[PDB]
């Protein structure tokens, strides 16, 4: 209601500033606050730094991706609709159930990480709180439209990032526990000290004690741990598939016009790497130095921002946490909710059941498969959750699964010899061998398929990465025997129920300004510093500063250059609510009006005289 | 009854009714402009000099 209220406001007095302001509100959600903390946790300072990197490259590429949207079939509605122009009938079911299930991957996700939260936190029973978190998202879906823009999202990148900044400057300066960042650097040598014994009872197995095993001398404070280089190249491959696949993100690709704002995509794709790389390392390294009881499969379901948040801030800190979650976690799910109704929609009831439909089925049908979706998840969301599957095991497999087909989704976009029916075998070959080959690693080195011998770094990696190339390699090989010479003509053609010089200049700065911070992030930094083989007392202080900065320039930036290019708007509602100058304007038409009346009739006008002396 | 109390909630917090009955009296002189032939050449020689 609070958008609702706004945009009337707006409505009854009628680049590059707020477009950055919705790339980093569509990025955002539960995984981003919750299993980047886990990872800082688990492995240390390299944990924030590859977590937020491996997840900012696809944000710079993917607008080389909406130029295609505005260059090879504009007009469209979803992804679906491209492959079933190009590749005829045989690929539109393959590459609608794989849509359909990394979209299911993707909520499930949201819901066992918002439930884990508040299961935890005001004692509300876990499973009622599986099911009724897809009913205020549902609300929101309906009440304000279905195609929701700017002015909400503007918002909830205001809510997070003003909890960004408390939570670094309470643990970094204002805390009276940790106080200054010499003071975690103090905290995070003693346990990694030889001379710590804490077997039993004195602590449990796995838990935050000793030496870690894969860092360099088992140090909180490296660059060269062994299990923080593994999960960057897991969170590559992951995120390839939400990116090309999730289909939420085309939509967004579609209304967005890549024309006059290219600068848009860059700018927002530096500002969200302050959001897992300034919170990862507060509240993840917060954890680590108070010695919290933190147990290995309680970090797993993502459970260390609120016991930061607690132990540091009581009440409000708990309170501030849940705020902003919430808004991350209902602003991305109806992102999702409409992507599967738009999915069910446009894709089939449309291509097979009622060609001939009009304007006023289609919101009908689009307005209940949010209500079906929603119910579905409520229920698919309790079935997990009696199994021990938590957040940080689904994020970890999600690309294993549907990761088979990212590549034959580009090849559809920017490759001229990609045939039909290769990614019939490209993308269907790719899953079973991903699942056999994660399988029998899991079963092969530990003796037992379980939840907790499937969500250890070795099986998971050597899934993803068999995942994402054989189907690419398949694809490959069936291309070059059977070329198509598509000419990108016929996707062209679909119902719509100097131009390519700006789109051909917009594409070359996206590639040029783009490529040459992806080697300065993923390439020059890691190795830059990989010589500190341990950090010195004084280099982990530019380490807390750079994170402070980077969380305050930033948050400056969104909160602030939205407000500063929009200004006449806010002028324009602020003078039509506080003053009367519409009223008066309007009577100073009336008066000039009469003046001609006036002046007109001869006679008048001097008995007007005669009146205005005689009062 | 919706339409009811969204009348009553429009007449207390905004200024809907004064607005409308303004819009009749410029309506109404909009026609005697249009009638006299010279004035309304006059309003245009006044609106360009202010």
Same mark, same amino acid.
């Not at 590429?61 to 979803?78: C, D, Q, S, Y």
């Not at 209902?330 to 999702?336: D, H, L, M, N, R």
């Not at 402070?548 to 806010?570: K, N």
């Given at each position: 209601?609070?958008?609702?209220?706004?945009?009337?406001?707006?409505?009854?007095?009628?680049?590059?500033?707020?477009?950055?302001?919705?790339?980093?509100?569509?990025?955002?959600?539960?995984?981003?606050?919750?299993?980047?903390?886990?990872?800082?946790?688990?492995?240390?300072?390299?944990?924030?730094?590859?977590?937020?990197?491996?997840?900012?490259?696809?944000?710079?590429?993917?607008?080389?991706?909406?130029?295609?949207?505005?260059?090879?079939?504009?007009?469209?509605?979803?992804?679906?609709?491209?492959?079933?122009?190009?590749?005829?009938?045989?690929?539109?079911?393959?590459?609608?159930?794989?849509?359909?299930?990394?979209?299911?991957?993707?909520?499930?996700?949201?819901?066992?990480?918002?439930?884990?939260?508040?299961?935890?936190?005001?004692?509300?029973?876990?499973?009622?709180?599986?099911?009724?978190?897809?009913?205020?998202?549902?609300?929101?879906?309906?009440?304000?439209?279905?195609?929701?823009?700017?002015?909400?999202?503007?918002?909830?990148?205001? !809510? +997070?990032?003003?909890?960004?900044? #408390? /939570? $670094?400057?309470?643990? %970094?300066?204002? @805390?009276?526990?940790?106080?200054? &960042? =010499?003071?975690?650097?103090?905290?995070?040598?003693?346990?990694?000290?030889?001379?710590?014994?804490?077997?039993?009872?004195?602590?449990?197995?796995?838990?935050?004690?000793?030496?870690?095993?894969?860092?360099?001398?088992?140090?909180?404070?490296?660059?060269?741990?062994?299990?923080?280089?593994?999960?960057?190249?897991?969170? !590559? +491959?992951?995120?390839?598939?939400? #990116? /090309? $696949?999730?289909?939420? %993100?085309?939509? @967004?690709?579609?209304?967005?016009? &890549? =024309?006059?704002?290219?600068?848009?995509?860059?700018?927002?794709?530096?500002?969200?790497?302050?959001?897992?790389?300034?919170?990862?390392?507060?509240?993840?390294?917060?954890?680590?130095?108070?010695?919290?009881?933190?147990?290995?499969?309680?970090?797993?379901?993502?459970?260390?921002?609120?016991?930061?948040?607690?132990?540091?801030?009581?009440?409000?800190?708990?309170?501030?946490?849940?705020?902003?979650?919430?808004?991350?976690?209902?602003?991305?799910?109806?992102?999702?909710?409409?992507?599967?109704?738009?999915?069910?929609?446009?894709?089939?009831?449309?291509?097979?059941?009622?060609?001939?439909?009009?304007?006023?089925?289609?919101?009908?049908?689009?307005?209940?498969?949010?209500?079906?979706?929603?119910?579905?998840?409520?229920?698919?969301?309790?079935?997990?959750?009696?199994?021990?599957?938590?957040?940080?095991?689904?994020?970890?497999?999600?690309?294993?699964?549907?990761?088979?087909?990212?590549?034959?989704?580009?090849?559809?976009?920017?490759?001229?010899?990609?045939?039909?029916?290769?990614?019939?075998?490209?993308?269907?070959?790719?899953?079973?061998?991903?699942?056999?080959?994660?399988?029998?690693?899991?079963?092969?080195?530990?003796?037992?398929?379980?939840?907790?011998?499937?969500?250890?770094?070795?099986?998971?990696?050597?899934?993803?990465?068999?995942?994402?190339?054989?189907?690419?390699?398949?694809?490959?090989?069936?291309?070059?025997?059977?070329?198509?010479?598509?000419?990108?003509?016929?996707?062209?053609?679909?119902?719509?129920?100097?131009?390519?010089?700006?789109?051909?200049?917009?594409?070359?700065?996206?590639?040029?300004?783009?490529?040459?911070?992806?080697?300065?992030?993923?390439?020059?930094?890691?190795?830059?510093?990989?010589?500190?083989?341990?950090?010195?007392?004084?280099?982990?202080?530019?380490?807390?500063?750079?994170?402070?900065?980077?969380?305050?320039?930033?948050?400056?930036?969104?909160?602030?250059?939205?407000?500063?290019?929009?200004?006449?708007?806010?002028?324009?509602?602020?003078?039509?609510?506080?003053?009367?100058?519409?009223?008066?304007?309007?009577?100073?038409?009336?008066?000039?009006?009469?003046?001609?009346?006036?002046?007109?009739?001869?006679?008048?006008?001097?008995?007007?005289?005669?009146?205005?002396?005689?009062?």
């Amino acid at each position: 209601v609070f958008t609702s209220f706004l945009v009337w406001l707006e409505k009854r007095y009628v680049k590059t500033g707020l477009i950055a302001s919705v790339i980093v509100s569509q990025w955002t959600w539960a995984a981003t606050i919750l299993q980047s903390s886990n990872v800082a946790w688990q492995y240390g300072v390299s944990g924030p730094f590859w977590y937020a990197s491996g997840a900012t490259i696809q944000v710079l590429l993917f607008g080389v991706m909406a130029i295609e949207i505005k260059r090879k079939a504009p007009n469209a509605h979803t992804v679906c609709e491209i492959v079933k122009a190009r590749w005829g009938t045989a690929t539109h079911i393959v590459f609608l159930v794989f849509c359909l299930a990394t979209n299911v991957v993707v909520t499930a996700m949201l819901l066992l990480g918002g439930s884990a939260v508040v299961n935890a936190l005001t004692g509300v029973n876990l499973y009622a709180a599986s099911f009724l978190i897809p009913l205020g998202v549902v609300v929101y879906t309906l009440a304000g439209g279905l195609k929701a823009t700017f002015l909400a999202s503007y918002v909830h990148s205001v !809510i +997070v990032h003003v909890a960004l900044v #408390v /939570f $670094v400057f309470l643990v %970094y300066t204002s @805390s009276k526990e940790l106080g200054s &960042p =010499s003071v975690v650097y103090d905290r995070l040598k003693d346990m990694v000290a030889k001379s710590r014994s804490c077997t039993e009872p004195l602590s449990h197995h796995g838990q935050a004690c000793g030496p870690v095993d894969g860092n360099f001398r088992g140090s909180y404070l490296t660059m060269l741990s062994s299990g923080g280089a593994v999960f960057g190249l897991i969170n !590559i +491959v992951g995120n390839f598939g939400t #990116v /090309f $696949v999730d289909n939420g %993100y085309w939509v @967004s690709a579609i209304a967005a016009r &890549p =024309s006059s704002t290219h600068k848009g995509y860059l700018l927002g794709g530096l500002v969200w790497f302050a959001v897992p790389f300034s919170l990862a390392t507060s509240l993840g390294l917060g954890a680590l130095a108070l010695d919290l009881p933190i147990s290995k499969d309680e970090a797993d379901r993502g459970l260390v921002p609120p016991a930061t948040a607690i132990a540091l801030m009581g009440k409000s800190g708990s309170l501030l946490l849940l705020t902003m979650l919430f808004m991350a976690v209902t602003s991305a799910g109806s992102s999702e909710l409409i992507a599967v109704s738009s999915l069910f929609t446009y894709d089939i009831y449309r291509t097979y059941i009622n060609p001939r439909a009009t304007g006023r089925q289609i919101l009908k049908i689009s307005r209940c498969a949010v209500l079906g979706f929603g119910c579905f998840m409520g229920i698919l969301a309790v079935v997990l959750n009696k199994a021990g599957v938590s957040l940080g095991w689904m994020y970890l497999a999600m690309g294993v699964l549907i990761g088979s087909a990212v590549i034959p989704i580009a090849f559809m976009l920017l490759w001229s010899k990609a045939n039909a029916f290769g990614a019939i075998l490209g993308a269907t070959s790719g899953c079973v061998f991903g699942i056999i080959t994660w399988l029998t690693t899991a079963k092969t080195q530990y003796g037992r398929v379980d939840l907790d011998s499937t969500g250890k770094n070795g099986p998971m990696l050597a899934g993803n990465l068999v995942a994402i190339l054989t189907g690419g390699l398949i694809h490959a090989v069936c291309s070059l025997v059977r070329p198509q010479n598509y000419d990108w003509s016929t996707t062209r053609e679909i119902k719509v129920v100097l131009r390519e010089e700006k789109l051909r200049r917009a594409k070359a700065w996206i590639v040029k300004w783009g490529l040459v911070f992806t080697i300065l992030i993923v390439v020059i930094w890691p190795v830059l510093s990989l010589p500190a083989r341990v950090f010195s007392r004084g280099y982990f202080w530019f380490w807390a500063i750079v994170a402070i900065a980077w969380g305050t320039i930033g948050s400056i930036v969104i909160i602030g250059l939205p407000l500063v290019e929009s200004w006449d708007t806010i002028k324009s509602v602020c003078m039509g609510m506080f003053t009367n100058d519409r009223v008066m304007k309007k009577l100073d038409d009336l008066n000039h009006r009469l003046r001609a009346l006036t002046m007109a009739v001869p006679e008048a006008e001097k008995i007007y005289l005669l009146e205005l002396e005689k009062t």
